[PDB]
Backbone as a printed PyTorch tensor [residue, N CA C, xyz], in Angstrom:
tensor([[[ -3.7840,  10.7160, -15.0420],
         [ -3.6750,   9.1170, -15.0370],
         [ -4.9230,   8.7210, -14.2590]],

        [[ -5.5630,   7.6160, -14.8130],
         [ -6.7140,   7.1010, -13.8750],
         [ -6.0410,   5.8720, -13.2570]],

        [[ -6.6690,   5.6990, -12.1890],
         [ -6.3970,   4.5060, -11.2740],
         [ -7.7790,   4.0080, -10.8530]],

        [[ -8.1440,   2.6720, -11.3610],
         [ -9.3140,   2.0250, -10.9600],
         [ -8.9900,   1.2370,  -9.7090]],

        [[ -9.6790,   1.5870,  -8.5750],
         [ -9.4050,   0.8500,  -7.3050],
         [-10.5020,  -0.0100,  -6.9850]],

        [[-10.5050,  -1.3970,  -7.0360],
         [-11.3890,  -2.4430,  -7.0290],
         [-11.2670,  -3.2390,  -5.6780]],

        [[-12.3480,  -3.2690,  -4.9660],
         [-12.3020,  -4.2720,  -3.7960],
         [-13.0650,  -5.4390,  -4.0460]],

        [[-12.2210,  -6.6150,  -4.3040],
         [-12.6990,  -7.8830,  -4.4320],
         [-12.6670,  -8.6090,  -3.0200]],

        [[-12.2410,  -7.9590,  -1.9900],
         [-12.4010,  -8.6490,  -0.7450],
         [-13.8690,  -8.9290,  -0.3920]],

        [[-14.1090,  -9.8520,   0.5270],
         [-15.4600, -10.2490,   1.0670],
         [-15.7950,  -9.1910,   2.1720]],

        [[-14.9970,  -8.2240,   2.5310],
         [-15.2850,  -7.2390,   3.5050],
         [-14.9410,  -5.9630,   2.9480]],

        [[-15.7230,  -4.9570,   3.4370],
         [-15.5310,  -3.5460,   3.1390],
         [-14.3580,  -3.0140,   3.3060]],

        [[-13.6730,  -2.2650,   2.3600],
         [-12.4560,  -1.4790,   2.7930],
         [-12.8470,  -0.0220,   2.5120]],

        [[-11.9840,   0.9220,   2.9750],
         [-11.9010,   2.3180,   2.7190],
         [-10.6620,   2.4700,   1.9300]],

        [[-10.7700,   2.7970,   0.7550],
         [ -9.5110,   3.0490,  -0.0510],
         [ -9.0940,   4.3810,   0.2880]],

        [[ -7.7660,   4.6170,   0.1220],
         [ -7.0360,   5.8150,   0.4300],
         [ -5.9880,   6.1250,  -0.6810]],

        [[ -5.8450,   7.4150,  -0.9160],
         [ -4.8730,   7.8650,  -1.9340],
         [ -4.4020,   9.1830,  -1.6160]],

        [[ -2.9590,   9.1420,  -1.3980],
         [ -2.3700,  10.3210,  -0.9730],
         [ -0.8670,  10.5320,  -1.4420]],

        [[ -0.3270,  11.7010,  -1.5540],
         [  1.1960,  11.8050,  -1.8220],
         [  1.8780,  12.1850,  -0.3680]],

        [[  1.2150,  12.1550,   0.6650],
         [  1.9610,  12.5150,   1.9270],
         [  1.6800,  13.8150,   2.5600]],

        [[  1.4830,  14.8110,   1.5390],
         [  1.2710,  16.1060,   1.9370],
         [ -0.0030,  16.6690,   1.1720]],

        [[ -0.8010,  15.7100,   0.6270],
         [ -2.0350,  16.1000,   0.0460],
         [ -2.6260,  14.8460,  -0.3260]],

        [[ -3.9300,  14.9390,  -0.3720],
         [ -5.0440,  13.9850,  -1.1140],
         [ -4.4510,  13.8050,  -2.5210]],

        [[ -4.6670,  12.6010,  -3.0970],
         [ -4.9430,  12.3760,  -4.4750],
         [ -6.4620,  12.3350,  -4.7530]],

        [[ -6.9240,  13.0460,  -5.7460],
         [ -8.2660,  12.9590,  -6.0960],
         [ -9.0560,  13.3140,  -4.7190]],

        [[-10.0780,  12.6160,  -4.4070],
         [-10.8450,  12.8740,  -2.9990],
         [-10.0840,  12.2440,  -1.7450]],

        [[ -9.1270,  11.4470,  -1.9840],
         [ -8.2700,  11.1130,  -1.0310],
         [ -8.6960,   9.6690,  -0.3600]],

        [[ -9.9790,   9.4750,  -0.2960],
         [-10.5870,   8.2480,   0.2010],
         [-11.9340,   8.0860,  -0.1390]],

        [[-12.4800,   6.7870,  -0.1380],
         [-13.8070,   6.3810,  -0.3150],
         [-14.0970,   5.0550,   0.0300]],

        [[-15.2770,   4.7120,   0.6340],
         [-15.7460,   3.3920,   0.9860],
         [-15.9480,   2.5350,  -0.2850]],

        [[-15.3610,   1.2990,  -0.1490],
         [-15.6450,   0.4070,  -1.3100],
         [-16.2740,  -1.0350,  -0.5400]],

        [[-17.5570,  -1.0660,  -0.6790],
         [-18.1280,  -2.4110,  -0.3120],
         [-17.5140,  -3.5180,  -1.2270]],

        [[-17.8020,  -4.6900,  -0.7730],
         [-17.1810,  -5.9260,  -1.4130],
         [-17.6730,  -5.8090,  -2.9510]],

        [[-16.8710,  -5.8070,  -3.9090],
         [-17.2520,  -5.8310,  -5.3940],
         [-17.1970,  -4.3140,  -5.9780]],

        [[-17.2120,  -3.3680,  -5.0290],
         [-17.1520,  -1.9660,  -5.6320],
         [-15.8720,  -1.4110,  -6.1420]],

        [[-15.9770,  -0.6110,  -7.1620],
         [-14.8860,  -0.0140,  -7.8550],
         [-14.9470,   1.5170,  -7.7620]],

        [[-13.8300,   2.1380,  -7.6100],
         [-13.6630,   3.6980,  -7.6300],
         [-12.5630,   4.0630,  -8.4840]],

        [[-12.9240,   4.9200,  -9.3890],
         [-11.9650,   5.4750, -10.3690],
         [-11.4620,   6.8410,  -9.9760]],

        [[-10.1390,   7.0010,  -9.7830],
         [ -9.5780,   8.2590,  -9.3940],
         [ -8.7570,   8.9010, -10.5290]],

        [[ -8.5540,  10.1380, -10.4140],
         [ -7.5930,  10.6970, -11.3940],
         [ -6.5210,  11.2630, -10.6490]],

        [[ -5.3680,  11.0080, -11.0850],
         [ -4.0140,  11.4310, -10.2670],
         [ -3.2960,  12.3500, -11.3280]],

        [[ -2.7750,  13.5000, -10.9290],
         [ -2.1790,  14.4550, -11.9140],
         [ -0.9420,  13.9480, -12.3890]],

        [[ -0.5130,  14.1160, -13.7370],
         [  0.7850,  13.7130, -14.1760],
         [  1.7830,  14.3620, -13.3110]],

        [[  2.9400,  13.6460, -13.1900],
         [  3.9720,  14.2210, -12.5400],
         [  4.0530,  13.8720, -10.9630]],

        [[  3.0210,  13.2430, -10.5740],
         [  2.8870,  13.0390,  -8.9910],
         [  4.0500,  12.1190,  -8.6580]],

        [[  4.7280,  12.5300,  -7.6160],
         [  5.9040,  11.6410,  -7.0720],
         [  5.5660,  11.2440,  -5.7430]],

        [[  5.8160,   9.8380,  -5.5560],
         [  5.5670,   9.4420,  -4.2610],
         [  4.1670,   9.3830,  -3.7330]],

        [[  3.3680,   8.9010,  -4.7100],
         [  1.9010,   8.6550,  -4.4080],
         [  1.8530,   7.3300,  -3.8290]],

        [[  0.7020,   7.1380,  -3.0700],
         [  0.4010,   5.8230,  -2.4440],
         [ -1.0620,   5.6930,  -2.4510]],

        [[ -1.3870,   4.3620,  -2.6280],
         [ -2.8870,   3.8340,  -2.5860],
         [ -2.8830,   2.8270,  -1.6090]],

        [[ -3.8160,   2.5220,  -0.6650],
         [ -3.8530,   1.5180,   0.3450],
         [ -5.3650,   1.4250,   0.6470]],

        [[ -5.5670,   0.1680,   1.4080],
         [ -6.8540,  -0.0770,   1.9050],
         [ -6.7650,   0.2420,   3.4600]],

        [[ -7.9810,   0.5450,   3.9870],
         [ -8.1980,   0.6520,   5.3280],
         [ -9.2280,  -0.1520,   5.8110]],

        [[ -9.1310,  -0.8520,   6.9620],
         [-10.2110,  -1.7940,   7.3310],
         [-10.7560,  -1.2560,   8.8010]],

        [[-12.0970,  -1.6510,   8.9110],
         [-12.7390,  -1.6050,  10.2190],
         [-12.9200,  -0.1110,  10.6360]],

        [[-13.3860,   0.6880,   9.6070],
         [-13.6280,   2.1560,   9.7950],
         [-14.7630,   2.6530,  10.3480]],

        [[-15.0340,   3.6720,  10.9960],
         [-16.2290,   4.4040,  11.3890],
         [-15.9940,   5.8120,  11.0640]],

        [[-16.9050,   6.4170,  10.3230],
         [-16.7170,   7.9780,  10.1210],
         [-18.3730,   8.4700,  10.4770]],

        [[-18.2080,   9.6480,  10.9210],
         [-19.4340,  10.5210,  11.2220],
         [-19.6330,  11.1310,   9.9190]],

        [[-20.8380,  11.9770,   9.9620],
         [-21.3860,  12.6290,   8.6090],
         [-20.4580,  13.4640,   8.0140]],

        [[-19.5640,  14.0680,   8.9730],
         [-18.5060,  15.1080,   8.3220],
         [-17.1920,  14.3070,   7.8590]],

        [[-17.0300,  13.0210,   7.9820],
         [-15.9140,  12.2760,   7.4290],
         [-14.8800,  12.2230,   8.4200]],

        [[-15.1300,  12.2330,   9.6550],
         [-14.2290,  12.1870,  10.7990],
         [-14.4490,  10.9780,  11.4510]],

        [[-13.3940,  10.1590,  11.8630],
         [-13.4640,   9.0330,  12.6810],
         [-12.3300,   8.2540,  12.9560]],

        [[-12.2710,   6.9140,  12.6400],
         [-11.1780,   5.9810,  13.1870],
         [-11.2810,   4.7490,  11.9890]],

        [[ -9.9290,   4.2740,  11.7530],
         [ -9.8940,   2.8830,  11.1730],
         [ -8.8330,   2.1930,  11.9330]],

        [[ -9.0190,   0.7090,  11.9020],
         [ -8.1010,  -0.0340,  12.5700],
         [ -6.7560,  -0.3350,  11.9050]],

        [[ -6.7290,  -0.2290,  10.5650],
         [ -5.4600,  -0.2840,   9.8820],
         [ -5.5890,   0.9560,   8.8360]],

        [[ -4.5560,   1.5730,   8.5750],
         [ -4.4020,   2.5410,   7.5710],
         [ -4.9400,   3.9500,   7.8920]],

        [[ -5.5040,   4.0680,   9.0800],
         [ -6.1560,   5.2950,   9.5180],
         [ -5.0810,   6.5800,   9.0370]],

        [[ -5.6750,   7.5230,   8.4340],
         [ -4.8360,   8.8120,   8.0380],
         [ -5.4160,   9.9500,   8.8490]],

        [[ -5.1080,  10.0060,  10.0140],
         [ -5.5220,  11.2190,  10.9940],
         [ -7.0030,  11.3300,  11.0870]],

        [[ -7.7260,  10.1420,  10.9150],
         [ -9.2160,  10.1470,  11.3630],
         [-10.0000,  10.5890,  10.1850]],

        [[ -9.3940,  10.7930,   9.0070],
         [-10.2400,  11.4040,   7.9250],
         [-10.6870,  10.3050,   7.0440]],

        [[-11.8900,  10.4950,   6.5090],
         [-12.3710,   9.5510,   5.3210],
         [-11.5090,   9.8690,   4.1530]],

        [[-11.3630,  11.2880,   3.9420],
         [-10.7350,  11.6950,   2.7720],
         [ -9.2970,  12.0090,   3.1630]],

        [[ -8.3860,  11.0420,   2.9620],
         [ -7.1140,  11.1440,   3.3090],
         [ -6.3680,  12.1600,   2.5930]],

        [[ -5.6180,  12.9600,   3.5750],
         [ -4.5570,  13.8530,   2.8960],
         [ -3.0650,  13.5290,   3.2060]],

        [[ -2.9540,  12.4820,   4.2520],
         [ -1.6430,  12.0830,   4.7760],
         [ -1.6020,  10.6710,   4.5470]],

        [[ -0.3980,  10.1530,   4.6600],
         [ -0.3200,   8.5440,   4.6600],
         [ -0.7990,   7.8810,   5.9600]],

        [[ -1.0760,   6.6420,   5.8340],
         [ -1.9960,   5.9000,   6.7700],
         [ -1.0380,   5.1610,   7.9200]],

        [[ -1.7750,   4.9160,   8.9600],
         [ -1.0980,   4.1780,  10.1000],
         [ -0.8210,   2.7830,   9.9050]],

        [[  0.4000,   2.2980,   9.9060],
         [  0.7060,   1.0070,   9.6700],
         [ -0.2000,   0.0390,  10.5940]],

        [[ -0.3890,  -1.1770,  10.2120],
         [  0.0370,  -1.7920,   9.0530],
         [ -0.7560,  -1.5630,   7.7060]],

        [[  0.1400,  -1.2800,   6.6930],
         [ -0.6530,  -0.9920,   5.4210],
         [ -0.0160,  -1.6520,   4.3430]],

        [[ -0.3630,  -2.6340,   3.5740],
         [  0.0200,  -2.8620,   2.2060],
         [  0.0520,  -1.7250,   1.4280]],

        [[  1.1490,  -1.2770,   0.5880],
         [  1.2590,  -0.0910,  -0.0980],
         [  1.3330,  -0.2770,  -1.6370]],

        [[  0.4540,   0.2350,  -2.4520],
         [  0.7620,   0.4200,  -3.8440],
         [  1.4330,   1.8290,  -3.9380]],

        [[  2.5440,   1.8610,  -4.6680],
         [  3.5620,   2.9980,  -4.5290],
         [  3.7070,   3.3970,  -5.9490]],

        [[  3.7630,   4.6460,  -6.4350],
         [  4.0180,   5.2370,  -7.6860],
         [  4.5650,   6.4790,  -7.9300]],

        [[  5.2400,   6.7950,  -8.8770],
         [  5.8480,   8.0380,  -9.1670],
         [  5.6780,   8.0930, -10.7540]],

        [[  4.9450,   9.1930, -11.0590],
         [  4.4760,   9.1890, -12.6330],
         [  5.0850,  10.2590, -13.2410]],

        [[  5.4830,  10.0780, -14.6110],
         [  6.2050,  11.1110, -15.4120],
         [  7.4500,  11.7220, -14.8740]],

        [[  8.2320,  10.5380, -14.4880],
         [  9.6890,  10.9200, -13.9850],
         [ 10.5310,  10.8070, -15.0660]],

        [[ 11.1530,  11.8490, -15.7790],
         [ 11.9720,  11.7520, -16.8550],
         [ 11.3340,  10.8780, -17.9210]],

        [[ 10.0860,  10.9750, -18.2700],
         [  9.2230,  10.2440, -19.2640],
         [  8.7030,   8.8750, -19.0400]],

        [[  8.8810,   8.3700, -17.7980],
         [  8.5650,   6.9810, -17.4460],
         [  7.6950,   7.0610, -16.1840]],

        [[  6.8900,   6.1150, -15.9190],
         [  6.2300,   5.8010, -14.6090],
         [  6.9880,   4.7520, -13.8010]],

        [[  6.8630,   4.7280, -12.5360],
         [  7.4550,   3.6840, -11.7820],
         [  6.4900,   3.1700, -10.6290]],

        [[  6.3170,   1.9380, -10.4800],
         [  5.3110,   1.2760,  -9.7370],
         [  5.8010,   0.2750,  -8.8140]],

        [[  5.3800,   0.0760,  -7.6320],
         [  5.8510,  -1.1500,  -7.0340],
         [  4.6990,  -1.4560,  -5.8290]],

        [[  4.9040,  -2.5190,  -5.2150],
         [  4.2650,  -2.6930,  -3.7290],
         [  5.2300,  -2.8460,  -2.8110]],

        [[  4.8890,  -2.3400,  -1.5870],
         [  5.7950,  -2.3570,  -0.4410],
         [  5.0730,  -2.8840,   0.7920]],

        [[  5.7760,  -3.7610,   1.5650],
         [  5.4370,  -4.1460,   2.8870],
         [  6.3220,  -3.5390,   3.9080]],

        [[  7.1070,  -2.4500,   3.6270],
         [  7.9720,  -1.7880,   4.5540],
         [  7.2600,  -1.1810,   5.7650]],

        [[  5.8990,  -0.7380,   5.4890],
         [  4.9230,  -0.4220,   6.5640],
         [  3.9100,  -1.4800,   7.0160]],

        [[  4.3290,  -2.6490,   6.7040],
         [  3.4740,  -3.8640,   7.1430],
         [  2.4270,  -4.2220,   6.1080]],

        [[  1.5420,  -4.9740,   6.4950],
         [  0.4970,  -5.6360,   5.4900],
         [ -0.7130,  -5.7910,   6.2510]],

        [[ -1.9170,  -5.3220,   5.4650],
         [ -3.0930,  -5.5720,   6.0160],
         [ -4.0270,  -6.2560,   5.1560]],

        [[ -4.0200,  -5.9550,   3.8100],
         [ -4.8700,  -6.4830,   2.8890],
         [ -4.1140,  -6.8280,   1.5360]],

        [[ -4.4090,  -7.9800,   0.9740],
         [ -3.5610,  -8.4870,  -0.1220],
         [ -3.9640,  -7.5210,  -1.5040]],

        [[ -3.1150,  -7.3720,  -2.4310],
         [ -3.1510,  -6.4240,  -3.3290],
         [ -2.4770,  -6.8060,  -4.6810]],

        [[ -3.1040,  -6.4380,  -5.7890],
         [ -2.6050,  -6.5620,  -7.1610],
         [ -2.4710,  -4.9800,  -7.5410]],

        [[ -1.4080,  -4.6410,  -8.2620],
         [ -1.2730,  -3.2480,  -8.8570],
         [ -0.6690,  -3.4360, -10.1590]],

        [[ -1.6090,  -3.2850, -11.2670],
         [ -1.2970,  -3.5610, -12.5330],
         [ -1.5820,  -2.3510, -13.4380]],

        [[ -0.8400,  -2.2190, -14.6600],
         [ -1.3240,  -1.2290, -15.5460],
         [ -2.4510,  -1.7440, -16.2980]],

        [[ -3.3390,  -0.8390, -16.7570],
         [ -4.4660,  -1.2030, -17.6570],
         [ -4.0490,  -0.7090, -19.1320]],

        [[ -2.8830,  -0.2290, -19.3380],
         [ -2.2990,   0.1150, -20.5760],
         [ -1.0980,  -0.5970, -20.8130]],

        [[ -0.6580,  -0.5230, -22.1010],
         [  0.5050,  -1.3780, -22.4540],
         [  1.8110,  -1.0190, -22.1560]],

        [[  2.6560,  -2.0660, -22.0850],
         [  4.1770,  -1.7090, -21.9670],
         [  4.8160,  -2.1240, -20.8820]],

        [[  4.2740,  -2.7720, -19.8500],
         [  4.9600,  -3.1460, -18.6500],
         [  4.0110,  -4.1040, -17.8930]],

        [[  4.4760,  -4.8300, -16.8740],
         [  3.7740,  -5.8240, -16.0350],
         [  3.3950,  -5.1970, -14.8500]],

        [[  2.3290,  -5.8300, -14.2270],
         [  1.9080,  -5.5370, -12.7380],
         [  2.7390,  -6.2530, -11.5990]],

        [[  2.4400,  -5.8740, -10.5990],
         [  3.0310,  -6.4490,  -9.2230],
         [  1.8840,  -6.9740,  -8.3140]],

        [[  2.3200,  -8.0330,  -7.6360],
         [  1.2910,  -8.4630,  -6.5440],
         [  1.8300,  -8.9060,  -5.3380]],

        [[  1.0670,  -8.7360,  -4.2190],
         [  1.4120,  -9.3390,  -2.8920],
         [  0.0520,  -9.7170,  -2.2570]],

        [[ -0.2670, -10.8370,  -2.6490],
         [ -1.4250, -11.5710,  -2.2490],
         [ -1.4490, -12.8440,  -1.4730]],

        [[ -0.3080, -13.3120,  -0.8920],
         [ -0.1910, -14.2940,  -0.0050],
         [ -0.7600, -13.9090,   1.3280]],

        [[ -1.1690, -15.0170,   2.2360],
         [ -1.9020, -14.8110,   3.3760],
         [ -0.9060, -14.2720,   4.5680]],

        [[ -0.3900, -13.0610,   4.3890],
         [  0.5600, -12.5730,   5.3820],
         [ -0.0130, -12.3790,   6.7270]],

        [[ -1.3440, -11.8500,   6.7980],
         [ -1.7650, -11.6930,   8.1150],
         [ -1.9790, -13.2480,   8.8880]],

        [[ -2.4630, -14.1060,   8.1930],
         [ -2.6620, -15.4760,   8.7850],
         [ -1.3950, -16.1200,   9.2700]],

        [[ -0.1610, -15.9420,   8.4140],
         [  1.1270, -16.3910,   8.5570],
         [  1.9950, -15.4540,   9.5180]],

        [[  1.5880, -14.3860,   9.8750],
         [  2.4110, -13.3290,  10.4770],
         [  3.1120, -13.8910,  11.8460]],

        [[  4.3860, -13.6370,  11.9630],
         [  5.1440, -14.0310,  13.1370],
         [  4.5230, -13.4790,  14.2830]],

        [[  4.3480, -14.1550,  15.4390],
         [  3.6200, -13.7390,  16.7180],
         [  4.0010, -12.3830,  17.0130]],

        [[  5.2190, -11.8670,  17.0280],
         [  5.7440, -10.6700,  17.5800],
         [  5.2390,  -9.5970,  16.6670]],

        [[  5.0000,  -9.7610,  15.3710],
         [  4.5520,  -8.7730,  14.5080],
         [  3.1220,  -8.5280,  14.3330]],

        [[  2.3300,  -9.4180,  15.0590],
         [  0.7360,  -9.3000,  14.9110],
         [  0.3040,  -8.1190,  15.5600]],

        [[ -0.4860,  -7.2390,  14.9510],
         [ -1.0060,  -5.9590,  15.4660],
         [ -2.2170,  -6.3650,  16.0700]],

        [[ -2.2340,  -5.9950,  17.4310],
         [ -3.5860,  -6.3250,  18.1880],
         [ -4.7850,  -5.5220,  17.3720]],

        [[ -4.7080,  -4.3870,  16.7010],
         [ -5.7130,  -3.6160,  16.1440],
         [ -5.9030,  -4.2580,  14.7080]],

        [[ -5.1990,  -5.4150,  14.3000],
         [ -5.4660,  -6.1500,  13.0480],
         [ -4.2740,  -5.9270,  12.0530]],

        [[ -3.8840,  -6.9570,  11.2330],
         [ -2.7620,  -6.9170,  10.3270],
         [ -1.4120,  -7.3740,  10.7940]],

        [[ -0.4770,  -7.2910,  10.1300],
         [  0.9400,  -7.6800,  10.2860],
         [  1.9690,  -6.6010,  10.1700]],

        [[  2.3300,  -6.1230,  11.4160],
         [  3.2760,  -5.0890,  11.3520],
         [  4.6170,  -5.4290,  10.7290]],

        [[  5.2790,  -4.4350,  10.2800],
         [  6.6900,  -4.3400,  10.0100],
         [  7.5070,  -4.2490,  11.2230]],

        [[  8.8160,  -4.6430,  11.2570],
         [  9.6020,  -4.7660,  12.3740],
         [ 10.0690,  -3.3930,  12.8220]],

        [[ 10.1680,  -2.3550,  12.0160],
         [ 10.4550,  -0.9640,  12.3300],
         [  9.2470,  -0.3910,  13.3880]],

        [[  8.0430,  -0.6060,  12.7970],
         [  6.9580,  -0.1800,  13.7500],
         [  6.9930,  -0.7660,  14.9190]],

        [[  7.3050,  -2.1390,  15.1060],
         [  7.1620,  -2.7570,  16.4150],
         [  8.4520,  -2.4590,  17.2270]],

        [[  9.6210,  -2.4570,  16.7830],
         [ 10.9050,  -2.3410,  17.5170],
         [ 11.7230,  -1.2400,  17.5540]],

        [[ 11.3400,  -0.3350,  16.6090],
         [ 12.0850,   0.9900,  16.5210],
         [ 13.5330,   1.0250,  16.6800]],

        [[ 14.2990,   0.1710,  15.9170],
         [ 15.7790,   0.1290,  15.8000],
         [ 16.2560,   0.7790,  14.5170]],

        [[ 17.4330,   1.0840,  14.6460],
         [ 18.1930,   1.5240,  13.2680],
         [ 18.2020,   0.5030,  12.3340]],

        [[ 18.2860,  -0.6870,  12.6660],
         [ 18.5470,  -1.7830,  11.8820],
         [ 17.2440,  -2.1080,  11.0500]],

        [[ 16.0430,  -2.0760,  11.8170],
         [ 14.6420,  -2.3880,  11.0690],
         [ 14.2430,  -1.1260,  10.3150]],

        [[ 14.5440,   0.0290,  10.8730],
         [ 14.0610,   1.1750,  10.2740],
         [ 15.0990,   1.8230,   9.1350]],

        [[ 16.2750,   1.1670,   9.0280],
         [ 17.2710,   1.6430,   8.1710],
         [ 17.5680,   3.1710,   8.2010]],

        [[ 17.7250,   3.6460,   9.4090],
         [ 17.9600,   5.0630,   9.8440],
         [ 19.0660,   5.5210,   9.2590]],

        [[ 20.1760,   4.7970,   9.3060],
         [ 21.5140,   5.2690,   8.9280],
         [ 21.6910,   4.9790,   7.4570]],

        [[ 20.8340,   4.4250,   6.7920],
         [ 21.0160,   4.0930,   5.3530],
         [ 21.9430,   2.8790,   5.3570]],

        [[ 22.3080,   2.3100,   6.4820],
         [ 23.0180,   1.1060,   6.5710],
         [ 22.1320,   0.1230,   7.3020]],

        [[ 21.5170,  -0.8620,   6.5390],
         [ 20.8460,  -2.0060,   7.2630],
         [ 20.8540,  -3.0440,   6.2480]],

        [[ 20.6600,  -4.4160,   6.7070],
         [ 20.6330,  -5.6030,   5.9000],
         [ 19.2550,  -6.0130,   6.1390]],

        [[ 18.9540,  -7.1280,   5.5380],
         [ 17.6700,  -7.9710,   5.6570],
         [ 17.7630,  -8.5300,   6.9440]],

        [[ 16.5680,  -8.8800,   7.5460],
         [ 16.4010,  -9.3260,   8.8840],
         [ 15.5110, -10.5770,   8.9030]],

        [[ 15.4400, -11.4510,   9.9340],
         [ 14.4540, -12.3670,  10.0310],
         [ 13.1080, -11.9910,   9.7790]],

        [[ 12.6660, -10.8150,  10.2800],
         [ 11.4030, -10.2660,  10.0340],
         [ 11.1980,  -9.9240,   8.5470]],

        [[ 12.1540,  -9.1330,   7.9200],
         [ 11.9500,  -8.7660,   6.4420],
         [ 11.9830, -10.0240,   5.6160]],

        [[ 12.7550, -10.9990,   5.9900],
         [ 12.7250, -12.2530,   5.1170],
         [ 11.3770, -12.9760,   5.3560]],

        [[ 10.4740, -12.8600,   6.2810],
         [  9.3100, -13.5070,   6.4090],
         [  8.3660, -12.8250,   5.1300]],

        [[  8.4310, -11.3100,   5.2990],
         [  7.7050, -10.6530,   4.2050],
         [  8.0530, -11.0900,   2.7840]],

        [[  9.4770, -11.1400,   2.6190],
         [ 10.0200, -11.4420,   1.2650],
         [  9.6340, -12.9060,   0.8550]],

        [[  9.5640, -13.7840,   1.7520],
         [  9.2220, -15.2280,   1.3270],
         [  7.8690, -15.2540,   0.8670]],

        [[  6.8440, -14.6580,   1.7720],
         [  5.4870, -14.5480,   1.3030],
         [  5.2360, -13.8750,   0.1030]],

        [[  6.0420, -12.8090,  -0.0250],
         [  5.7500, -11.9110,  -1.2410],
         [  7.0910, -11.4020,  -1.8790]],

        [[  7.7280, -12.1980,  -2.7130],
         [  8.9090, -11.9550,  -3.2350],
         [  8.8150, -10.5830,  -4.1520]],

        [[  7.5910, -10.2190,  -4.6030],
         [  7.4810,  -9.1130,  -5.5330],
         [  7.2290,  -7.7740,  -4.9540]],

        [[  7.3110,  -7.5950,  -3.6350],
         [  7.0950,  -6.4810,  -2.8850],
         [  8.4340,  -6.2400,  -2.0020]],

        [[  8.6400,  -4.9240,  -1.6560],
         [  9.7200,  -4.3510,  -0.8680],
         [  9.4400,  -4.9470,   0.5400]],

        [[ 10.4140,  -5.6550,   1.0980],
         [ 10.3240,  -6.1740,   2.5280],
         [ 11.0790,  -5.2860,   3.5060]],

        [[ 12.0460,  -4.3900,   3.1450],
         [ 12.8460,  -3.5140,   3.9350],
         [ 13.2330,  -2.3720,   3.1290]],

        [[ 13.7420,  -1.3450,   3.7110],
         [ 14.1010,  -0.1520,   2.9920],
         [ 15.2610,  -0.3450,   1.7460]],

        [[ 16.1570,  -1.0850,   2.1040],
         [ 17.3390,  -1.3850,   1.1580],
         [ 17.0440,  -2.7790,   0.3800]],

        [[ 15.9690,  -3.2170,   0.3300],
         [ 15.5780,  -4.5620,  -0.3840],
         [ 16.1810,  -4.1230,  -1.9330]],

        [[ 16.4720,  -5.2770,  -2.5900],
         [ 16.6810,  -5.2610,  -4.0400],
         [ 15.3820,  -4.9120,  -4.6970]],

        [[ 15.4530,  -3.8160,  -5.3680],
         [ 14.1800,  -3.2320,  -5.8740],
         [ 13.3160,  -4.2310,  -6.7890]],

        [[ 11.9700,  -3.9440,  -6.5340],
         [ 10.9930,  -4.6860,  -7.3200],
         [ 10.0380,  -3.7920,  -8.0310]],

        [[ 10.6270,  -2.5190,  -8.3210],
         [  9.9280,  -1.3930,  -8.9780],
         [  9.9280,  -1.8400, -10.5050]],

        [[  8.6620,  -1.6100, -11.1670],
         [  8.5050,  -1.8160, -12.5400],
         [  8.5300,  -0.4320, -13.2180]],

        [[  9.1680,  -0.4150, -14.3680],
         [  9.1010,   0.8130, -15.2990],
         [  8.0440,   0.7830, -16.2700]],

        [[  7.0680,   1.7330, -16.2050],
         [  6.0540,   1.7440, -17.2390],
         [  6.1710,   2.9040, -18.1500]],

        [[  5.5530,   2.8280, -19.2560],
         [  5.5170,   4.1510, -20.0560],
         [  4.9490,   5.3180, -19.4090]],

        [[  5.5140,   6.4380, -19.5770],
         [  4.9240,   7.6220, -18.8830],
         [  3.5000,   7.7610, -19.1600]],

        [[  2.7180,   8.2990, -18.2610],
         [  1.3750,   8.3220, -18.4860],
         [  0.5190,   7.1670, -18.7370]],

        [[  1.0570,   6.0280, -18.1420],
         [  0.0830,   4.8220, -18.0410],
         [ -1.0260,   5.0490, -17.1750]],

        [[ -1.9700,   4.1000, -17.2640],
         [ -3.1010,   4.1300, -16.3930],
         [ -3.1190,   2.6370, -15.6550]],

        [[ -3.8320,   2.5370, -14.5420],
         [ -3.4840,   1.3400, -13.5200],
         [ -4.8900,   0.9690, -12.8100]],

        [[ -4.8420,  -0.1840, -12.2310],
         [ -5.8470,  -0.7350, -11.4790],
         [ -5.1740,  -1.3790, -10.3540]],

        [[ -5.7350,  -0.9880,  -9.1280],
         [ -5.4210,  -1.4990,  -7.8720],
         [ -6.3820,  -2.4180,  -7.3170]],

        [[ -6.3310,  -3.6830,  -7.1750],
         [ -7.2860,  -4.6440,  -6.8020],
         [ -6.9530,  -5.1230,  -5.4010]],

        [[ -7.7990,  -4.9920,  -4.3010],
         [ -7.6060,  -5.4530,  -3.1470],
         [ -8.2310,  -6.9620,  -3.2680]],

        [[ -7.5250,  -7.8490,  -2.6000],
         [ -7.9600,  -9.3700,  -2.5760],
         [ -8.1460, -10.0110,  -3.9180]],

        [[ -7.0210,  -9.6940,  -4.7030],
         [ -7.3090, -10.0740,  -6.1990],
         [ -7.5180, -11.5720,  -6.3880]],

        [[ -7.0050, -12.5200,  -5.4620],
         [ -7.3510, -13.9200,  -5.5890],
         [ -8.0840, -14.4340,  -4.4880]]])
């Protein structure tokens, strides 16, 4: 499957793509404002994610740091990124269908649209100014808007027991972005697409 990752932000981002235990494609690339990077993701990939990283520095070997979404200091991510990270999430060719969503469960750094480029389903978007509107206690000093689990490490925010409800913090994310997951047990906003669809992830769509 192809995923075109487009940076419409006015700032550089370092795109990342992983399934948690491996890179997808090269795993990461710098995208200056306006740049696009097309990756190939193997059919059947379960639990893939794409995200933006901000304020990164990498040496010539591809090792360094980012302020949001850092994946173990690598340009080419093999693992998931450090919150806060707006997440484009997907599982492909799962009993003949693909499943896509956006999640704020690991916080929000950069606004995102995640849409099919092929027929048969709709896209999802979280493009409100979550960083600007972020509750004081969730603001990450390193940049972005943390989720409450990251900040407070409680069973309730982290849904550790598989019993949790919405919270004042999750409701903030949900108010700003109704079509993204705001906590683990949120009413799903996952879209079913034809198996083997192709996609575009756009940072700063609006």
